[PDB]
Every structure is written in C-alpha cells, then in structure tokens.
Design an enzyme around this catalytic site. Structure first.
Site, mmCIF file in Angstrom:
data_model
loop_
_atom_site.group_PDB
_atom_site.id
_atom_site.type_symbol
_atom_site.label_atom_id
_atom_site.label_comp_id
_atom_site.label_asym_id
_atom_site.label_seq_id
_atom_site.Cartn_x
_atom_site.Cartn_y
_atom_site.Cartn_z
ATOM 1 N N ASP A 34 -7.798 -26.177 -47.008
ATOM 2 C CA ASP A 34 -6.568 -26.800 -47.472
ATOM 3 C C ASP A 34 -5.309 -26.396 -46.737
ATOM 4 O O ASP A 34 -4.703 -25.380 -47.064
ATOM 5 C CB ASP A 34 -6.424 -26.610 -49.011
ATOM 6 C CG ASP A 34 -5.235 -27.332 -49.618
ATOM 7 O OD1 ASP A 34 -4.804 -28.349 -49.043
ATOM 8 O OD2 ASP A 34 -4.778 -26.917 -50.705
ATOM 9 N N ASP A 224 -1.931 -32.562 -44.528
ATOM 10 C CA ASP A 224 -2.714 -31.963 -45.613
ATOM 11 C C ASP A 224 -4.212 -32.292 -45.622
ATOM 12 O O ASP A 224 -4.628 -33.285 -46.213
ATOM 13 C CB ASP A 224 -2.061 -32.279 -46.987
ATOM 14 C CG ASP A 224 -2.724 -31.577 -48.159
ATOM 15 O OD1 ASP A 224 -3.546 -30.666 -47.919
ATOM 16 O OD2 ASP A 224 -2.408 -31.920 -49.315
HETATM 17 C C1 LIG Z 1 -10.325 -32.395 -52.383
HETATM 18 C C2 LIG Z 1 -9.433 -33.164 -53.350
HETATM 19 C C3 LIG Z 1 -10.039 -34.535 -53.628
HETATM 20 O O1 LIG Z 1 -9.360 -32.519 -54.613
HETATM 21 C C4 LIG Z 1 -8.658 -31.308 -54.641
HETATM 22 C C5 LIG Z 1 -8.972 -30.441 -55.673
HETATM 23 C C6 LIG Z 1 -8.324 -29.226 -55.761
HETATM 24 C C7 LIG Z 1 -7.371 -28.886 -54.827
HETATM 25 C C8 LIG Z 1 -7.036 -29.756 -53.803
HETATM 26 C C9 LIG Z 1 -6.001 -29.413 -52.780
HETATM 27 N N1 LIG Z 1 -4.586 -29.840 -53.088
HETATM 28 C C10 LIG Z 1 -4.467 -31.334 -53.174
HETATM 29 C C11 LIG Z 1 -3.054 -31.788 -53.505
HETATM 30 C C12 LIG Z 1 -2.364 -31.026 -54.631
HETATM 31 C C13 LIG Z 1 -2.499 -29.517 -54.467
HETATM 32 C C14 LIG Z 1 -3.927 -29.059 -54.206
HETATM 33 C C15 LIG Z 1 -3.931 -27.585 -53.908
HETATM 34 C C16 LIG Z 1 -0.875 -31.320 -54.536
HETATM 35 N N2 LIG Z 1 -0.626 -32.575 -55.272
HETATM 36 C C17 LIG Z 1 0.810 -32.765 -55.565
HETATM 37 S S1 LIG Z 1 -1.700 -32.724 -56.585
HETATM 38 O O2 LIG Z 1 -1.129 -32.195 -57.812
HETATM 39 O O3 LIG Z 1 -2.344 -34.016 -56.552
HETATM 40 N N3 LIG Z 1 -2.692 -31.451 -56.027
HETATM 41 C C18 LIG Z 1 -3.951 -31.373 -56.730
HETATM 42 C C19 LIG Z 1 -5.037 -32.226 -56.651
HETATM 43 C C20 LIG Z 1 -6.152 -31.990 -57.439
HETATM 44 C C21 LIG Z 1 -6.175 -30.918 -58.323
HETATM 45 C C22 LIG Z 1 -5.077 -30.082 -58.392
HETATM 46 F F1 LIG Z 1 -5.013 -29.024 -59.208
HETATM 47 C C23 LIG Z 1 -3.975 -30.308 -57.604
HETATM 48 C C24 LIG Z 1 -7.697 -30.960 -53.711
#
Ligand SMILES: CC(C)Oc1cccc(CN2CC[C@@]3(C[C@@H]2C)CN(C)S(=O)(=O)N3c2cccc(F)c2)c1
Ligand SMILES: [Zn+2]
Length: 394
Positions: A34, A224
């Site tokens: 990430d 990202d």
């Molecule tokens: C691989 C993808 C599909 O799923 C993920 C799951 C966990 C972390 C990430 C990385 N990443 C994705 C975007 C992020 C922050 C997080 C660290 C920022 N955004 C503003 S958010 O709130 O959407 N948000 C997100 C998305 C899903 C869950 C969550 F808690 C936050 C991606």
C-alpha cells in the site's frame, strides 16, 4: 533483480500482496502493498476472514511498545498494539530489519473475505503514519538499517467460482529493465506524505476536458497501489464519464454500470474495445513548463469479472469512480505501467509495463515532453485546520 520479479500476488479488485516474515521463529504472512498509507500493521487475533494471524507472544525477538493505535478511515478501521520485531521479505533483499509493527486486535470492514492477505505494508511517508510522524514507517527503517537504496518500483499486472488471480513485482532498492519498454518519465513528488503528484491536463480520446487544472488535483492527486480504481474528484469524474459515455454510445449500459456497481457482458472474445476511448493524464515534468502523458486503455479501466450465471461471456466492471478526497491513481492506472517510487530523488517514474493488457490496435503509453508557456500552478493548497497547525515537528 530476478529474485524479486513476480513476488506479488492477489485476487482482481482485492489488492496486491507480498509475502513477509515477522518474528523469531519467522511467521509467514501475506501483506497488502500500500503506497497510500504508512503503517506496517498485521492481523494479530482470530478473524473470520483470516487464514492466520501474527502471534507476538511466540516471537523471541518481539518487543512491546506499551502503546496502542486507533486508525479510522471512511470505509473501515483497525486498532492495535504497537511493538517492534525482526522483519524480512523472502522474495526481496537478503536483509532482516527491526521495524515498527501494529498488531491488529480489532477491525471493521478492513480485511477482505478471500483476499488471502492478513496485513498491510504502508509504503508512504512518516507524515501520514499513525499515531504520529515519530512512528518510523517500514521502508524508512529498511533504508536506515541496511545498504538498500532509497527507491522501490512496482509492476502490477492486470487480469468461475473465484476472482481472477493477479501477479506483480515489487523491486526493492532498484529498477529492473525487463519490466518495461521505452522511456521512463519522472514527475516530482509534490510533498512527502502520500506520494503526491500534479496533473496538468486530462484528455479523453485526444479531447481536452478543458477544466481549470486545479480541479484535477482538488484536494490532492496521489499514486495508490492500495486502491483498485482510478478515482477522480466529483467535477472531473462527471466530465470524464460524460465523455466516455459519448464515445461508447452505440452501447446503452444501465446506470449501475457507470456507478461501478454492475457488470456488462459480451459473447466471449467479441468485446468492442474500440468504442471505448483512451484516457491520458498529463503529469508535471521535472523541468518547469514540461509535462509527459500516461495513456490508459479500456483494458485498464474495464475490470474483467467472470460470471457464474454467464460463464460463456466476457464481463466487465467500470473501474473509474468519484472521489471527494482528490485523484487516486490506483491499480487501474498502475496496471498500465512500471512505476518507480524514487524517494532519494523526490520523484515518481512511469514507463510502459511489459505486462500491461492491450490489443493489436492500441497500447498504454508514456510520452513526452509536452510544453506550456507560463504554466499556471495546478496544485491545490488544503485548508489548514487548527488541529494540524497546533502540531509541533521536533
Ligand atoms: C485492496 C482494497 C480493495 O481494499 C483495501 C482494504 C484495506 C486497506 C486498503 C488500503 N487503503 C485503501 C484506501 C483507504 C485507506 C486504506 C489504507 C483510503 N480511503 C479514503 S478508504 O477509506 O476507502 N480506505 C479504505 C478502504 C478499505 C478499507 C479501509 F479501512 C480503508 C485497501
Ligand atoms: Zn514543541
């Protein structure tokens, strides 16, 4: 860097992960790569979606920091206990680092069912680390403790009962020339927090969106690897979708398609790719008044999903979506390119990926220079809250 080629895996739309070892004896864990966060955090207690978790008590090298951390986001959250432990990347550099590690004890809508990953490797800068910028990110510790150059590069490679498998490469400490073709163009990192960049122009099939360029970076534009889609600010998303709809108009898709909530299908191998336009993002160059463009195909922004109910059809999800937190150049952008996170030189490199998905008529492209006389500032200055202003930076 042969040993690091093909070291990333994942499921389409569920992120790219790298295998890492934590502790002594080493505990094997799959970790989300990430570039949009700065914490190294791992599932550390049972969860319905985890095939395993980090067990701190079983590592002889684990040190408790006696401090917890709460990390909320819009779409989910995690909380955990801070500590340090020995960390290695088996298909990475031949080194062991003592890094900070947040042991995730509680979470909501963070882990994904079937993703095969149990943690996250935040590769962005200390400014955005939680709880504060004194918690050293992993990449900073790796560079400080070993002779590994201050650079990493990513080649994310795009794709009935399961989602398609994806592959990729994270080259730590260098650039691997077999991963790209043609020229490598660099865009400055605006500020070291997220990997923030500046978009100066947007074209859809060679047609300029003609918006004030600050709109493209309202409130920021970031690279990202942790985000699937190309996310665009509201006004930009509207203008872009209006344009893609017009070029693809011989096909009348449901609203759910354009909202990224519904698949659209065609008989296997008959997908009319040429009705979908290319998208070009012009990024600020290293030279004043120069820019270069990164061009993606519908093969990048139309995500393949295999339907159980329609196995004999090629189905796709529209992977461009609206944002209220600026532009996010996710996997949709990254899958077209080999991306160089040149931290030592405060710059991001883009070259055509040797693995990008294309056809016999069009390819993803990286082209420059493009010149503009007396180029206006396309950067947006985020309103400064009293809370952020009050922070000291010792
Ligand atoms: C691989 C993808 C599909 O799923 C993920 C799951 C966990 C972390 C990430 C990385 N990443 C994705 C975007 C992020 C922050 C997080 C660290 C920022 N955004 C503003 S958010 O709130 O959407 N948000 C997100 C998305 C899903 C869950 C969550 F808690 C936050 C991606
Ligand atoms: Zn002070």
């Amino acid at each position: 860097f042969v040993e690091m080629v093909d070291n990333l895996r994942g499921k389409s739309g569920q992120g790219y992960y790298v295998e890492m070892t934590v502790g002594s004896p080493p505990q094997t864990l799959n970790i989300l790569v990430d570039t949009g966060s700065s914490n190294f955090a791992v599932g550390a207690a049972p969860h319905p979606f985890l095939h395993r978790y980090y067990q701190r008590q079983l590592s002889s090298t684990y040190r408790d920091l006696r401090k917890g951390v709460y990390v909320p986001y819009t779409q989910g959250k995690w909380e955990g206990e801070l500590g340090t432990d020995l960390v290695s990347i088996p298909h990475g550099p031949n080194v062991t680092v003592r890094a900070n590690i947040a042991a995730i004890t509680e979470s909501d809508k963070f882990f994904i069912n079937g993703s095969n990953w149990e943690g996250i490797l935040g590769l962005a800068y200390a400014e955005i680390a939680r709880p504060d910028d004194s918690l050293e990110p992993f990449f900073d510790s790796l560079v400080k403790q070993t002779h590994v150059p201050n650079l990493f590069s990513l080649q994310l490679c795009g794709a009935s009962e399961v989602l398609a498998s994806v592959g990729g490469s994270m080259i730590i400490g260098g650039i691997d020339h077999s991963l790209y073709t043609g020229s490598l163009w660099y865009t400055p990192i605006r500020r070291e927090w997220y990997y923030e960049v500046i978009i100066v122009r947007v074209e859809i099939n060679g047609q300029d969106l003609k918006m004030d360029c600050k709109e493209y970076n309202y409130d920021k534009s970031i690279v990202d690897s942790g985000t699937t889609n190309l996310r665009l600010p509201k006004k930009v998303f509207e203008a872009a979708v209006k344009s893609i709809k017009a070029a693809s108009s011989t096909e009348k898709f449901p609203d759910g398609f354009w909202l990224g909530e519904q698949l659209v299908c065609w008989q296997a191998g008959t997908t009319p790719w040429n009705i979908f336009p290319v998208i070009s993002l012009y990024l600020m160059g290293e030279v004043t008044n120069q820019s270069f463009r990164i061009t993606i195909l519908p093969q990048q922004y139309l995500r393949p999903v295999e339907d159980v109910a329609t196995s004999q059809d090629d189905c796709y999800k529209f992977a461009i979506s609206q944002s209220s937190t600026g532009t996010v150049m996710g996997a949709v952008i990254m899958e077209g390119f080999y991306v160089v996170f040149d931290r030592a030189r405060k710059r991001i490199g883009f070259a055509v990926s040797a693995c990008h998905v294309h056809d016999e008529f069009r390819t993803a492209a990286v082209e420059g220079p493009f010149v503009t006389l007396d180029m206006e500032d396309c950067g947006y200055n985020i309103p400064q809250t009293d809370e952020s202003r009050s922070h000291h930076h010792h």
